[PDB]
Swiss-Prot record:
Similarity-based family: Belongs to the Bcl-2 family.
Motif BH3 boundaries: 50-64
Gene: BCL2L1
Protein's recorded name: Bcl-2-like protein 1
Quaternary structure and interacting proteins, as annotated: Homodimer. Interacts with BCL2L11. Interacts with BAD. Interacts with PGAM5. Interacts with HEBP2. Interacts with p53/TP53 and BBC3; interaction with BBC3 disrupts the interaction with p53/TP53. Interacts with ATP5F1A and ATP5F1B; the interactions mediate the association of isoform Bcl-X(L) with the mitochondrial membrane ATP synthase F(1)F(0) ATP synthase. Interacts with VDAC1. Interacts with BCL2L11 (via BH3). Interacts with RNF183. Interacts with GIMAP3/IAN4 and GIMAP5/IAN5.
Tissue-level expression: Bcl-X(S) is expressed at high levels in cells that undergo a high rate of turnover, such as developing lymphocytes. In contrast, Bcl-X(L) is found in tissues containing long-lived postmitotic cells, such as adult brain.
Length: 177
């Protein structure tokens, strides 16, 4: 459908969203509305490099930037019939001054918050729609856009270690006044 490594990028978005789903209290053995999921599971071999880089980079950015995380889910919790229109509103809002470091880094928080709000509303049937539509349009062109070498190669190179680089409060500072 798009790219040859689509399975790798689709697995990354689905891995963070699958980890957060269970982190709230979701068990695969809970049978939550006849839930099982079994068809070409993720983790083709290792995927531990990027998984650890996303968990460390996303834990630090979420723990240092939980301000907009709440406003994101508080503006678009979950609808009974999501669409591209809703996805365009969240993307156009984050794309106003944030790409990759803010669009993607915050996207993991948007997909995890929308998934937990649907499962609690019995709307888990839409979680596969929002997760596929978001993971598709993301890896489609949003992956090769900036995540190409400045994301996959940057995350594997730095090991997804971005704590002080995010806060931007540990540089030379002092520009005016």
């Amino acid at each position: 459908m798009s790219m040859a490594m689509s399975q790798s990028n689709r697995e990354l978005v689905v891995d963070f969203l699958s980890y957060k789903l269970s982190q709230k209290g979701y068990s695969w053995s809970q049978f939550s509305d006849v839930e099982e999921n079994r068809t070409e599971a993720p983790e083709g071999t290792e995927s531990e490099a990027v998984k650890q880089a996303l968990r460390e980079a996303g834990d630090e950015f979420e723990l240092r930037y939980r301000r907009a995380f709440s406003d994101l889910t508080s503006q678009l919790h979950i609808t009974p019939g999501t669409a591209y229109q809703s996805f365009e509103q969240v993307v156009n809002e984050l794309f106003r001054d944030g790409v990759n470091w803010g669009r993607i880094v915050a996207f993991f928080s948007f997909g995890g918050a929308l998934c937990v709000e649907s499962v609690d509303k019995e709307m888990q049937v839409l979680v596969s729609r929002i997760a596929a539509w978001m993971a598709t349009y993301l890896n489609d062109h949003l992956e090769p856009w900036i995540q190409e070498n400045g994301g996959w190669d940057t995350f594997v190179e730095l090991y997804g270690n971005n704590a002080a680089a995010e806060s931007r409060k540990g540089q030379e500072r002092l520009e005016h006044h």
